[PDB]
Design a binder for this molecule. Structure first.
Ligand SMILES: Nc1ncnc2c1ncn2[C@H]1C[C@H](O)[C@@H](COP(=O)(O)O)O1
Ligand SMILES: Nc1ncnc2c1ncn2[C@H]1C[C@H](O)[C@@H](COP(=O)(O)O)O1
Ligand SMILES: Nc1ncnc2c1ncn2[C@H]1C[C@H](O)[C@@H](COP(=O)(O)O)O1
Ligand SMILES: Nc1ncnc2c1ncn2[C@H]1C[C@H](O)[C@@H](COP(=O)(O)O)O1
Ligand SMILES: [Ca+2]
Ligand SMILES: [Ca+2]
Ligand SMILES: [Ca+2]
Ligand SMILES: [Ca+2]
Ligand SMILES: [Ca+2]
Lengths: 549, 49
DNA sequence: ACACCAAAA
DNA sequence: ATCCTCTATCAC
DNA sequence: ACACCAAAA
DNA sequence: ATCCTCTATCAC
DNA sequence: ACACCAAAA
DNA sequence: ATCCTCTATCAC
DNA sequence: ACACCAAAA
DNA sequence: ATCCTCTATCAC
């Protein structure tokens, strides 16, 4: 009944072209996964308190307090661009398309391999013998109804290999439980004590304990078996593949010229601000690009390092990414910093556990904010403001030298319109579930695609308990034959895009590579070494200029 | 803005033997969940390894 | 329960 | 004998 | 007035 | 002889 | 890909 | 043989 | 063996 | 289950 493959390797990508320039991209992912016995035979409600760090006065923003539930099951997440497309392709799509959208996903497991190891040769030295058990089995299940909490692997760089010819493994399934942690505020050395840094116990009203076994239909897989998913259909909104620029200052009718340049050097002039036509919502009897009326507000002011806290403890508030601006205000316009590692980039020949990191600066210009120049004038507008007639990014709030209006000012509002972030090539997350909150969020910074209806059930896997001749239930803690396994996973991801139209004149930014240089875009980066090592560097999504008005 | 029950509605007279009855209004509304939540920004998804 | 507000409910 | 300020869920 | 923007307007 | 950056309210 | 979450998917 | 916490995209 | 490479293989 | 760099001797 065995000795015959149950599936087929294929990690291709097809571009099906249709009329009106629509395109049906098809992602093919095949991967070899390894898996060994889950140490805990059961479910463990474990706790984590880093008093070693929480105790310091300034430290809190380093708080790791929580209590997870460790399941003996392992997750199989493929929700990460890096797993489906090939570097070059992402280039192609981005350099050529105008929009992209998720269509359907199809998963498949096969060619199960189960083996047990017997450490023998005690009569000579210390060897290890490998051989497979046929009767042994693996276990699969899919939380299609999504009873279990969502656990995105990119939420930890623990998704699957971005390199096909190299194997990979699964992240173990773990989920949060209810506690109610609490921590007090302190700075550098201050005085007194940390008044109380408590954790807490399980609350009757919010205790939620699930079990793969009481929630899903588990399927047994021996060597000759094989498993396959249904075919999930994505109900999502497409993502544009173009950055913008125009800011409140460049929206529509540029002022009228009265003076025309003489040579390619000197510039031109407008009409007297006093004696100029237009409209404004300030009382002054003149006009200036600065005070002129615009359609709405592009981008907005966000509060810096707004660590807020609830029964859970403290945490930094998330925030809509945006251009960093000349002001190089990163933490100010939510750029993101990733810390991937060798199955997801890294070089490969990089030494030490030190993970490689990358900060992503959003490309939706005209939406960014430069803290420095941001200022609030007063009342009745005055040509040149007094002193106590304008608060700037110098004046301190609540008696702190470096804390300014910026770090607490929130520009958001009705006329505040912006742009949806972009996806990051390798390392980036693809789709995500929606919060079951009667009132939803205009988007997640976590990922590009958010499912409007139900979402892809998570795929769980676990090896089966291979017992010994000895067994007592009431028995303290007991033996089980060593065992581990492998299997291939095959995924199908279909997308839809359309070709961009060329209308400018002046060519336009394209993602390209460069000769052996010190350039960010240097072929060599996406090339093997003499021993065969390579890295995957994030790439620009939305190389081409859009238009917003 | 000054209104008057008498210039706006159709008033019906009811003596002892009379009786009055409404139409049948249909609610066009959104349902209300009957469960509280807990999870906060600190417990959303992948717990650390 | 149309009959979802300004049209063709 | 309830339908968005009339008659008129009249707009069915 | 379809023709509501990314599909099957 | 106007439909969301082409042709092409082409998607009717 | 209906099957858009609370009904008449 | 994935549909919003069951069976059950069961609501087609 | 059409199926000869850029169309109407 | 081989057709000119994909799917697709798909162009039959
Ligand atoms: N659209 C339309 N045209 C004519 N008569 C209507 C219409 N809709 C309801 N009715 C009738 C039905 C009742 O006789 C009355 C209610 O007001 O009007
Ligand atoms: N969907 C679709 N297919 C084919 N021809 C179309 C379609 N819609 C409009 N038209 C025709 C009608 C006019 O002859 C022309 C306008 O462009 O295209
Ligand atoms: N609405 C409804 N009524 C009865 N049976 C249904 C319905 N929808 C799907 N099904 C059937 C189709 C399959 O036999 C099964 C799937 O669950 O139920
Ligand atoms: N010209 C053309 N149109 C459509 N389908 C085709 C054509 N030539 C071959 N085929 C079919 C025959 C097989 O089903 C498949 C092979 O690819 O495509
Ligand atoms: Ca269900
Ligand atoms: Ca009435
Ligand atoms: Ca036209
Ligand atoms: Ca089912
Ligand atoms: Ca072929």
């Amino acid at each position: 009944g065995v000795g015959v493959s149950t599936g087929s390797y294929d990690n291709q990508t097809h571009y099906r072209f249709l009329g009106d320039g629509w395109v049906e991209i098809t992602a093919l992912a095949t991967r070899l996964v390894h898996l060994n016995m889950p140490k805990s035979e059961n479910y463990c409600r474990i706790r984590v308190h880093n008093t070693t760090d929480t105790s310091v006065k300034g430290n809190m923003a380093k708080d790791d307090a929580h209590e997870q539930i460790w399941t003996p099951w392992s997750l199989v997440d493929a929700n990460a661009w890096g797993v489906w497309l090939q570097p070059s392709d992402w280039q192609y799509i981005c350099n050529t398309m105008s929009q992209l959208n998720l269509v359907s996903l199809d998963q498949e497991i096969f060619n199960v391999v189960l083996k047990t190891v017997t450490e023998q040769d005690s009569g000579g030295q210390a060897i290890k013998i490998y051989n497979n058990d046929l009767t042994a089995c693996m276990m699969v299940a899919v939380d299609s109804n999504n009873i279990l909490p969502y656990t995105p692997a990119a939420n930890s760089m623990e998704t699957l290999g971005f390199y096909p010819w190299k194997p990979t493994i699964a992240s173990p399934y773990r989920y949060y439980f209810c506690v109610d942690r609490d921590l007090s505020v302190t700075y550098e050395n201050q005085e007194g004590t940390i008044e109380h840094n408590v954790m807490g116990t399980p609350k009757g009203m919010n205790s939620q304990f699930f079990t793969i076994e009481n929630t899903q239909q588990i399927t047994l897989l021996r060597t000759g078996d094989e498993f396959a998913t249904g075919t999930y259909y994505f109900d999502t909104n497409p993502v544009k593949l173009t950055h913008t620029w125009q800011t409140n200052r460049q929206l529509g009718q540029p002022p009228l010229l009265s003076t025309f340049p003489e040579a390619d050097t000197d510039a031109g002039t407008l009409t007297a601000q006093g004696s100029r036509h237009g409209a404004t919502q300030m009382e002054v009897n003149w006009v200036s690009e600065a005070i002129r009326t615009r359609p709405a507000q592009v981008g907005f002011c966000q509060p810096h390092n707004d660590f807020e806290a609830s029964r859970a403890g403290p945490f930094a508030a998330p925030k809509v990414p945006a251009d960093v601006t000349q002001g190089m205000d990163r933490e100010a316009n939510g750029s993101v910093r990733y810390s991937y590692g060798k199955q997801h980039g890294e070089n490969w020949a990089a030494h030490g556990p030190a993970p490689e990191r990358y900060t992503w600066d959003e490309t939706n210009f005209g939406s960014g904010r430069d803290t420095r120049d941001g200022f609030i004038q007063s009342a009745p507008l005055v040509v040149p403001p007094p002193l106590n007639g304008i608060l700037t990014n110098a004046n301190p709030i609540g008696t702190k030298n470096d804390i300014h209006f910026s770090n607490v000012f929130n520009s958001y509002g009705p006329l505040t319109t912006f742009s949806h972030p972009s996806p990051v090539y390798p390392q980036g997350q693809i789709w995500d579930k929606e919060l079951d909150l009667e009132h939803k969020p205009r988007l997640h910074i976590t990922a590009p695609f958010v499912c409007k209806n139900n979402a892809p059930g998570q795929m769980l896997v676990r090896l089966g308990p291979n017992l010994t001749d000895q067994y007592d239930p009431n028995g303290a803690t007991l033996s089980r034959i060593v065992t581990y396994g492998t299997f291939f996973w095959k995924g199908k991801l279909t997308m839809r895009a359309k070709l961009r139209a060329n209308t400018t004149w002046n060519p336009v930014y394209q993602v390209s590579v460069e000769d052996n240089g010190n350039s960010y875009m240097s072929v060599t980066k996406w090339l093997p070494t003499a021993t065969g090592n390579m890295q995957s560097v994030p790439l620009i999504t939305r190389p081409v200029a859009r238009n917003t008005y």
